[PDB]
Amino acid sequence: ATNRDQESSGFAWWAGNARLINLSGKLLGAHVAHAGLIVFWAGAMTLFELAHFIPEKPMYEQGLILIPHIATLGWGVGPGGEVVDTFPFFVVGVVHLISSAVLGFGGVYHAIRGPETLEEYSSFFGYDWKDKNKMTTILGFHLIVLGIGALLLVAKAMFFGGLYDTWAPGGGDVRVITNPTLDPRVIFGYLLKSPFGGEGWIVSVNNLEDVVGGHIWIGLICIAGGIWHILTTPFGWARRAFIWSGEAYLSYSLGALSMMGFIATCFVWFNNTVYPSEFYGPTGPEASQAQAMTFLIRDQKLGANVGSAQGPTGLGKYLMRSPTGEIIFGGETMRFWDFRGPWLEPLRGPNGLDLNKIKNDIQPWQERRAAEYMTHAPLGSLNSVGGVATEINSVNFVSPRSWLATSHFVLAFFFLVGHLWHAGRARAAAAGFEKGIDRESEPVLSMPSLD
Amino acid sequence: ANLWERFCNWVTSTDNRLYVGWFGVIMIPTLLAATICFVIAFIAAPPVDIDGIREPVSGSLLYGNNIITGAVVPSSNAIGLHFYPIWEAASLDEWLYNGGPYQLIIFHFLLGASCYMGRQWELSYRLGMRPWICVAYSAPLASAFAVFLIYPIGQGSFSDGMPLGISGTFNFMIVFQAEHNILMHPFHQLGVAGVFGGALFCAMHGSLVTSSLIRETTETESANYGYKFGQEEETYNIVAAHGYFGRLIFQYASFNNSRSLHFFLAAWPVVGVWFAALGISTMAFNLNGFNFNHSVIDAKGNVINTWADIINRANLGMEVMHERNAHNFPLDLA
Amino acid sequence: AELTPEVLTVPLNSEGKTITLTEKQYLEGKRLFQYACASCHVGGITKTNPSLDLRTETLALATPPRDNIEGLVDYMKNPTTYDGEQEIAEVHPSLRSADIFPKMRNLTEKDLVAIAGHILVEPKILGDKWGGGKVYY
Amino acid sequence: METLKITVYIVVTFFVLLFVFGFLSGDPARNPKRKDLE
Amino acid sequence: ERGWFDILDDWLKRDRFVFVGWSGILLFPCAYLALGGWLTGTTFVTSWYTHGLASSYLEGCNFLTVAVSTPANSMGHSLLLLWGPEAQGDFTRWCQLGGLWTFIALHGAFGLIGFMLRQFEIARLVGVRPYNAIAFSAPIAVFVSVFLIYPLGQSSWFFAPSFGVAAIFRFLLFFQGFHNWTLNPFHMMGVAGVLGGALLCAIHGATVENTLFQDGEGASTFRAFNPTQAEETYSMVTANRFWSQIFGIAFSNKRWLHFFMLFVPVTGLWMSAIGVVGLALNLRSYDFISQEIRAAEDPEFETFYTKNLLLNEGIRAWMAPQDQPHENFVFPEEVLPRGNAL
Amino acid sequence: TTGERPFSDIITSVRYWVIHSITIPALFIAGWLFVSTGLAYDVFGTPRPDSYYAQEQRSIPLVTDRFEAKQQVETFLEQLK
Numbered sequence A: 001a002t003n004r005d006q007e008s009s010g011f012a013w014w015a016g017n018a019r020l021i022n023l024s025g026k027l028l029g030a031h032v033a034h035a036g037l038i039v040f041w042a043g044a045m046t047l048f049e050l051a052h053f054i055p056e057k058p059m060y061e062q063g064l065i066l067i068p069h070i071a072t073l074g075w076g077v078g079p080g081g082e083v084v085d086t087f088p089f090f091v092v093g094v095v096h097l098i099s100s101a102v103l104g105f106g107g108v109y110h111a112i113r114g115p116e117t118l119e120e121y122s123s124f125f126g127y128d129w130k131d132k133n134k135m136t137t138i139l140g141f142h143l144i145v146l147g148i149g150a151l152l153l154v155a156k157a158m159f160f161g162g163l164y165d166t167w168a169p170g171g172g173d174v175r176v177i178t179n180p181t182l183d184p185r186v187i188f189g190y191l192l193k194s195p196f197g198g199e200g201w202i203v204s205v206n207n208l209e210d211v212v213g214g215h216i217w218i219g220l221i222c223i224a225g226g227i228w229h230i231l232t233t234p235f236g237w238a239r240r241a242f243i244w245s246g247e248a249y250l251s252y253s254l255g256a257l258s259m260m261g262f263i264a265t266c267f268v269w270f271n272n273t274v275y276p277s278e279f280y281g282p283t284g285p286e287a288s289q290a291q292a293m294t295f296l297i298r299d300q301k302l303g304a305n306v307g308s309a310q311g312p313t314g315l316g317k318y319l320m321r322s323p324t325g326e327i328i329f330g331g332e333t334m335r336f337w338d339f340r341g342p343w344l345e346p347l348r349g350p351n352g353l354d355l356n357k358i359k360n361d362i363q364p365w366q367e368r369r370a371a372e373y374m375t376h377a378p379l380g381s382l383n384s385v386g387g388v389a390t391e392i393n394s395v396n397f398v399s400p401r402s403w404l405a406t407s408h409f410v411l412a413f414f415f416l417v418g419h420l421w422h423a424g425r426a427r428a429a430a431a432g433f434e435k436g437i438d439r440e441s442e443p444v445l446s447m448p449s450l451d
Numbered sequence B: 001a002n003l004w005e006r007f008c009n010w011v012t013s014t015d016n017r018l019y020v021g022w023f024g025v026i027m028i029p030t031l032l033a034a035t036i037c038f039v040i041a042f043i044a045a046p047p048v049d050i051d052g053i054r055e056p057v058s059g060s061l062l063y064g065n066n067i068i069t070g071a072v073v074p075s076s077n078a079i080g081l082h083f084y085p086i087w088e089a090a091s092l093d094e095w096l097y098n099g100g101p102y103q104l105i106i107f108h109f110l111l112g113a114s115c116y117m118g119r120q121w122e123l124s125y126r127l128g129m130r131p132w133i134c135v136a137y138s139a140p141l142a143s144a145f146a147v148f149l150i151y152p153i154g155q156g157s158f159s160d161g162m163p164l165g166i167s168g169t170f171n172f173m174i175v176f177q178a179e180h181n182i183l184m185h186p187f188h189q190l191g192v193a194g195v196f197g198g199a200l201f202c203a204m205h206g207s208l209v210t211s212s213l214i215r216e217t218t219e220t221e222s223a224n225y226g227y228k229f230g231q232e233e234e235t236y237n238i239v240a241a242h243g244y245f246g247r248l249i250f251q252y253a254s255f256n257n258s259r260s261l262h263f264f265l266a267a268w269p270v271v272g273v274w275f276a277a278l279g280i281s282t283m284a285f286n287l288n289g290f291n292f293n294h295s296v297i298d299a300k301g302n303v304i305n306t307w308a309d310i311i312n313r314a315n316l317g318m319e320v321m322h323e324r325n326a327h328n329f330p331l332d333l334a
Numbered sequence C: 001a002e003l004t005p006e007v008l009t010v011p012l013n014s015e016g017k018t019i020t021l022t023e024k025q026y027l028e029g030k031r032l033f034q035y036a037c038a039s040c041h042v043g044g045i046t047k048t049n050p051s052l053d054l055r056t057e058t059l060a061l062a063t064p065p066r067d068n069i070e071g072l073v074d075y076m077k078n079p080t081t082y083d084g085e086q087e088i089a090e091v092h093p094s095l096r097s098a099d100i101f102p103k104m105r106n107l108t109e110k111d112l113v114a115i116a117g118h119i120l121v122e123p124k125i126l127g128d129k130w131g132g133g134k135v136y137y
Numbered sequence D: 001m002e003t004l005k006i007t008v009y010i011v012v013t014f015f016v017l018l019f020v021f022g023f024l025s026g027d028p029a030r031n032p033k034r035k036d037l038e
Numbered sequence E: 001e002r003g004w005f006d007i008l009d010d011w012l013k014r015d016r017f018v019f020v021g022w023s024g025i026l027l028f029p030c031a032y033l034a035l036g037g038w039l040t041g042t043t044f045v046t047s048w049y050t051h052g053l054a055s056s057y058l059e060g061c062n063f064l065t066v067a068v069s070t071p072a073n074s075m076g077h078s079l080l081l082l083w084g085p086e087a088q089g090d091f092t093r094w095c096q097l098g099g100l101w102t103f104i105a106l107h108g109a110f111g112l113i114g115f116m117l118r119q120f121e122i123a124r125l126v127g128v129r130p131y132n133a134i135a136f137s138a139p140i141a142v143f144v145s146v147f148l149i150y151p152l153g154q155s156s157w158f159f160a161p162s163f164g165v166a167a168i169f170r171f172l173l174f175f176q177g178f179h180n181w182t183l184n185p186f187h188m189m190g191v192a193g194v195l196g197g198a199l200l201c202a203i204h205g206a207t208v209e210n211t212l213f214q215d216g217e218g219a220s221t222f223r224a225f226n227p228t229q230a231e232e233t234y235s236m237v238t239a240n241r242f243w244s245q246i247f248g249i250a251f252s253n254k255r256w257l258h259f260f261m262l263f264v265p266v267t268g269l270w271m272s273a274i275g276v277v278g279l280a281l282n283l284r285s286y287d288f289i290s291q292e293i294r295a296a297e298d299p300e301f302e303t304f305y306t307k308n309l310l311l312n313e314g315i316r317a318w319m320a321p322q323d324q325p326h327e328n329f330v331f332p333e334e335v336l337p338r339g340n341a342l
Numbered sequence F: 001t002t003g004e005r006p007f008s009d010i011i012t013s014v015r016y017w018v019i020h021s022i023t024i025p026a027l028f029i030a031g032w033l034f035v036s037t038g039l040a041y042d043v044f045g046t047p048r049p050d051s052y053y054a055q056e057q058r059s060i061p062l063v064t065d066r067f068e069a070k071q072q073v074e075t076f077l078e079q080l081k
């Protein structure tokens, strides 16, 4: 019953978990139990999704986020992202759910029954936050694990069925990636890319060879780094740059997670490669483009020459130029001209949209896809009324892309706030004034007036 | 001491009339750039083609604006989220026509203001203070990020960022209401609770403290002279304040701990404004307010209007009129 | 006002025979229409082609006439352009193209009748609202 | 324009370097209380 | 001289869990009735006969859409007493005619009077200055100007705000579209008062919490404070240096700081109230004449001002017929202002 | 303190719960019945779902006279067959 009230610990109940900072056994318990919760929700949610799943409805009309993830990995789906076997979904769910019990068991055991601290029990599993060597060694272990995970994705792509490739010839299909991009110029080229329009930084990855190769580099880098940190201890400059404490390490991780959350938000909002539109619905840019395309097709069938039709502003009604000359769709969608997608690319030539291909080569499947995407634009109300804010009730729809992007923006934001909170606190605690100013030693009083 | 060390000591010096610091090293040049461009633009910038349809909007004073109608106009819809620095333009004339000043201003400002937050943390650490003032400032900062950066990213264009001007702000708000029904969004509602509440508690705290000032002055002098800067003793009786406000409501609704009181005063508007900011940021990805349009239906199936439907009519007026020449196709998808 | 049998009585064919639907049929029609059609036809308009709506007056002037059960059911089987000249199954959901519009796969004859009856009954209830677009919201 | 570009690039890099190296220069020890923070 | 009045006075001022006082005789029934009427109305009462709207839980509305709606425009500024010439004592008709609206508004008004009187009464009993009451003049001014004066300048109670969440949102949008209220400098002063108020609340709370003296050993700093302690709990000197160096200027007088906290939001609300009194007579800040002359003559001239007017014109045309049913506006589609395509 | 019994004392006493385990659900049921018997409709004059309109009509029964409003409503109600 050590350290479980305010008097002994110094912490109120509302900061109760701060009581765990130097109780490594119990902290191990809290962590394992929490991981337990993560895997639980994964399994349970997957099963829930599966029970509510109708294969003939697009996934994105069904409030699904986990099944799309599984499908993208190549399981259960076939050409065009049609579902051919729901059983892998079932397996992934069930296995996660069973595992959560093991994790919960370990978590609860270390949390209440097991050794409260580990340092006396095991020099190996025991640690002092201020032991830089130990901290970097644990860090090393975990880097090695992450590396193996990345390699697992690579293994799925190259040796175990492949991945779903929205860009595969003849509509989407699962494809084995035989030649992953290993050219470092490409890989790290993505990293040095601008985050602005038409560049899109790493969010711009648009083929699976690049994704796979990138994960090879990541896996190798991680394992190598893990060995590096296991074998070493932080250098002097590093030692002088950082705060070395539990709360400090937490704060660093918090900033990390925030950054990753914002990236995820943009990935799911813009990328249609690792988030295929077949599964997640069209992107916003995609649906806007799709509307332009839809009306170009309709109006052309009625006899319009779309290439020369002048709109009210004097810009082309259907087609105009981008600021660098490329032929693009007109109307407000002029902003979305950087969009690339498998249904549109056949109409593209060297100078952008090709008027001859527009006149002669538009297939019924493209018209269909444009109509579908245009009518599944990621617009919708909080109670899941699809469409613009002024639309009436009828369509129960909010896009997966919206759900994911919004959730992860909220989370990333609060995680940045958490970073500020804990980093500032860690600084103040390490210097010794996190509980307030010492009256007998108030620094400002020992400072000259500003005026 | 070497030159680098000397410089580092001056930068982090607690003796400078205004603290510089490392965040200040980024903050100063960036805010200066934003401010100078803003002022020059507000006065003298020629009209800008905000919506990319070759229909330039006049924002500056010299071109027919007053203080209320003037603005630095958002960059062209043809630019979208593309990066448009001066050196990406063929001439300053192009750059101006296309709304380049807006980009220069907001990127410099957001950078600078982030470093402002940082600088708040930094000076608190030099002075041996507790570190969380910057966390309070993270709420107005996140809000600025919402309307100048996040919302454009979601909508695909800086042309939909908030314009830098008074009537421009109003425009942004009205169109926002049309497209997202923000009034019906619970985050905006919490925002309103945050600021209405913050105002209430501001007045409340102020009036209670003021009404419990210990008499230290005569009637011919300002009561303010009864407090002396640096004095060790408190200047008001928190027990009298407590006794009064306790009786106004009931005892257990009033604070008697000044620290809890002040924490509450900090927490309410900050949390509220955080929600307000998250609203704009999540409506940036088109997860909009509640839609109860035609939610009430009679036995036969007639639509029975509620206040939500009236709201919808007003929203429709906004939608159909906004950017009257920019849409060729029937749905306004961004 | 109630959902009476008079309301639920609609033209079955061009000859002027009527069928009377049940409240259950009508509601099933509304649900199925929301499932299969509303993404384009919410409120009786057409999002990907606003020129053609689901107003009875419009369906009556289609070729062949679509302002009756048989017409609508046939349309859901084998859709044509408004003049009857072209078959548009390749770009419009129908039983003929349930391979490329998978949502049509689990629709039965009973279902087509229900959807049809819904499309015919709604305007008798909502008036101008049906097919009217945002002006009547 | 190219001249302007290079100028801005140089300027930004200068200030960023000041920032990074500044925070690398024993910053935790720049507080009024405890200084042995390594 | 211990007569009945003084004995009654004794009882009214007993130190009980809920203080009563003389003011409570006004305050308690009226506040109870105003709250009572609102919960009753939003639960059970329609607005079909006054607005053509469902507005109660009973009808299928939720918490956001329920309301006690204003009476029909044809009632004018009728007090709408239950025993009045309109309802004629009939409770049900009285509910159908909008009687609960004037009921709530009037009892609410006297209730607010009672609450302020209560502030004076308790301040006087305890021996504090009456600045809380004074500060409360601002909510009273807002309420009186918006719920009483504004409709009294207009045609009838109909155009007052209705008591409900969405109804109030409608009120906001109506004010933009018909009054161009965002353009009004008195509203702008209100906004700066309110935002400035929230700002002061946050900055003061944060400053105090981050300049605390370590008055205890715990990591929870709340415990280290005693209400009867003589010492300040946070350093005003450190706070002052912080803000002087961050922002250039800082407070140095605590009394001035708290007075300023009273002054800023109270003055803001008072300013906004004056503007609404103008809107009662349609005395708006609608236009800038110079702008209209230039724009009339010069079709290339465009500002955010002219853009916002276009939005207002849309709001009016599209919401008027449903929002003002008694006018019988019939606007054929062809007259509705619309941009291209939309 | 001001004399009354502290709430914690009261709401954790068996007697409080003996009284209120009856009085509370009893009130809940009376409120339920008030709606379920349709009495609420008649008391407040709120339309049941089939009484907003006549079967064929689509005009709102708006009150348009101040001193005849009661009779107007009574007429609108008569016209609902």
Ligand code: CLA
Residues within 6 Å of the ligand: A002, A003, A004, A005, A012, A013, A014, A015, A016, A017, A018, A019, A020, A023, A026, A027, A029, A030, A031, A033, A034, A101, A104, A105, A108, A111, A112
């Ligand atoms: C992921 C969420 C999470 C986790 C894993 C923990 C974990 C922990 N908390 Mg924290 N805490 C949390 C959230 C969490 N907390 C929240 C939200 C609050 C705010 C209320 C707190 C406030 C708080 C305080 C004030 C304290 C803790 C303490 C603790 C530690 C000991 C608790 C104990 O001994 O109770 C014993 C409790 C019981 C014996 C009752 C049942 C507990 C078990 C674990 C529930 C198991 C149920 C589950 C269904 C069983 C499945 C078994 C199956 C696998 C076979 C433990 C590591 C204590 C601590 O730090 O100790 C030094 C402590 O003093 N917590």
Ligand code: CLA
Residues within 6 Å of the ligand: A028, A032, A102, A103, A105, A106, A107, A109, A110, A114, A115, A118, A121, A122, A125
């Ligand atoms: C966060 C992970 C983690 C860590 C670092 C520890 C660490 C520890 N555990 Mg705990 N524990 C955990 C999770 C963890 N446990 C889980 C999930 C369970 C439920 C199965 C338990 C149940 C448990 C019990 C009942 C006991 C411990 C004990 C111990 C201590 C001795 C363990 C040892 O020396 O085994 C030697 C190492 C091995 C036997 C290797 C294990 C190989 C595993 C089982 C195969 C799979 C590993 C692979 C990585 C799985 C992938 C996992 C991933 C997919 C999530 C040590 C402090 C003992 C203790 O505290 O003594 C007082 C003890 O009695 N643990």
Ligand code: CLA
Residues within 6 Å of the ligand: A136, A143, A191, A192, A221, A222, A224, A225, A226, A228, A229, A232, A233, A234, A235, A238, A241, D020
């Ligand atoms: C889990 C992730 C992780 C973490 C937390 C650490 C943590 C650490 N590493 Mg290790 N490392 C890792 C993975 C990790 N490493 C991997 C995978 C490798 C193999 C590549 C390495 C290889 C490595 C080496 C060779 C060294 C470290 C060192 C360190 C220590 C110094 C950190 C530092 O000062 O960086 C501060 C960050 C910088 C200095 C970055 C440069 C400044 C730029 C301008 C920042 C801007 C970047 C921008 C925001 C990013 C946007 C994208 C960008 C690519 C464009 C610290 C304990 C040092 C050490 O002391 O080891 C004993 C050291 O010498 N690491």
Ligand code: CLA
Residues within 6 Å of the ligand: A041, A045, A048, A049, A052, A062, A063, A064, A065, A382, A384, A400, A403, A404, A407, A408, A410, A414, B271
């Ligand atoms: C990454 C997180 C995430 C995302 C993107 C989604 C997305 C979705 N979920 Mg899933 N779900 C999640 C986590 C998530 N969920 C979790 C944690 C659970 C366990 C409770 C579930 C259990 C679940 C069920 C049972 C169902 C869904 C369903 C859905 C779909 C409809 C959502 C909806 O209508 O919500 C409505 C919107 C809300 C309820 C808004 C909540 C606002 C919160 C409370 C604000 C909190 C803010 C912040 C966290 C607090 C900060 C406090 C501050 C002081 C620090 C949508 C695709 C539905 C579906 O269609 O399934 C197929 C469905 O039936 N989800």
Ligand code: CLA
Residues within 6 Å of the ligand: A013, A014, A015, A016, A017, A018, A250, A254, A414, A415, A416, A417, A418, A419, A421, A422, A425
């Ligand atoms: C990996 C993430 C992580 C971890 C391990 C920690 C760990 C810690 N935090 Mg930190 N924190 C984090 C992220 C994290 N934090 C983030 C993202 C924020 C920004 C909001 C914070 C903000 C924060 C503050 C302000 C404080 C801490 C504190 C602490 C310490 C005590 C925590 C505690 O006992 O709370 C107990 C848990 C509760 C009281 C429960 C909170 C309930 C939330 C608000 C519910 C949210 C609603 C939910 C999402 C949806 C609704 C569900 C509902 C309808 C059922 C502990 C070291 C304290 C500290 O300083 O310690 C030194 C402290 O004062 N944290």
Ligand SMILES: CC1=C(/C=C/C(C)=C/C=C/C(C)=C/C=C/C=C(C)/C=C/C=C(C)/C=C/C2=C(C)CCCC2(C)C)C(C)(C)CCC1
Residues within 6 Å of the ligand: A029, A030, A033, A034, A036, A037, A040, A094, A097, A098, A100, A101, A103, A104, A105, A107, A108, A111
């Ligand atoms: C420490 C602590 C805590 C926490 C805890 C936790 C977090 C725990 C967890 C736990 C867990 C995490 C658990 C889990 C479990 C699980 C399970 C137990 C499962 C089972 C499963 C099953 C049984 C399955 C079944 C099935 C099948 C197989 C098929 C399908 C269907 C079904 C589903 C039926 C708290 C906060 C309270 C506080 C105090 C301390």
Ligand SMILES: CC1=C(/C=C/C(C)=C/C=C/C(C)=C/C=C/C=C(C)/C=C/C=C(C)/C=C/C2=C(C)CCCC2(C)C)C(C)(C)CCC1
Residues within 6 Å of the ligand: A186, A187, A188, A190, A191, A202, A205, A210, A211, A212, A213, A214, A215, A217, A218, A241, D019, D020, D021, D023, D024
């Ligand atoms: C997988 C993949 C890929 C790849 C990727 C990669 C390859 C990545 C990498 C990445 C990286 C490589 C990253 C990095 C990062 C870094 C960072 C993020 C840093 C940070 C830093 C910091 C934070 C610092 C701080 C500080 C300062 C500034 C001063 C002094 C003090 C201190 C230290 C505090 C690709 C795209 C191809 C495709 C898809 C998939």
Ligand SMILES: CC1=C(/C=C/C(C)=C/C=C/C(C)=C/C=C/C=C(C)/C=C/C=C(C)/C=C/C2=C(C)CCCC2(C)C)C(C)(C)CCC1
Residues within 6 Å of the ligand: E032, E033, E035, E036, E037, E038, E039, E040
């Ligand atoms: C008008 C009138 C009157 C009066 C009446 C009364 C006085 C009434 C009252 C009534 C009442 C007095 C009622 C109450 C009600 C209540 C309710 C209905 C409540 C509800 C609640 C809830 C729902 C809750 C919610 C929540 C919140 C808010 C937050 C927290 C969480 C929760 C969720 C819990 C007389 C006879 C004189 C005469 C004639 C006229």
Ligand SMILES: CCCCCCCCCCCCO[C@@H]1O[C@H](CO)[C@@H](O[C@H]2O[C@H](CO)[C@@H](O)[C@H](O)[C@H]2O)[C@H](O)[C@H]1O
Residues within 6 Å of the ligand: A236, A237, A238, A240, B004, B005, B008, D020, D021, D024, D025, D026, D027, D029
């Ligand atoms: C594009 C980003 C580039 C990032 C490169 C990162 C490389 C990391 C190693 C850099 C070398 C360390 O450089 C770091 O800064 C200065 C340089 O004189 C050193 O010198 C410093 O010494 C002490 C440190 O307590 C300071 O008080 C003093 O002001 C300063 O002279 C630091 O002791 C050293 O830690």
Ligand SMILES: [Ca+2]
Residues within 6 Å of the ligand: A132, A133, A134, A135, A136, A137, A229, A230, A231, A232, A233
């Ligand atoms: Ca090591």
Ligand SMILES: [Cl-]
Residues within 6 Å of the ligand: A330, A331, A332, A333, B326, B327, B328, B329
């Ligand atoms: Cl358009």
Ligand SMILES: [Cl-]
Residues within 6 Å of the ligand: B171, B175, B321, B322, B323, B324, E307
């Ligand atoms: Cl506009």
Ligand SMILES: [Fe+2]
Residues within 6 Å of the ligand: B205, B209, E204, E208
């Ligand atoms: Fe204060």
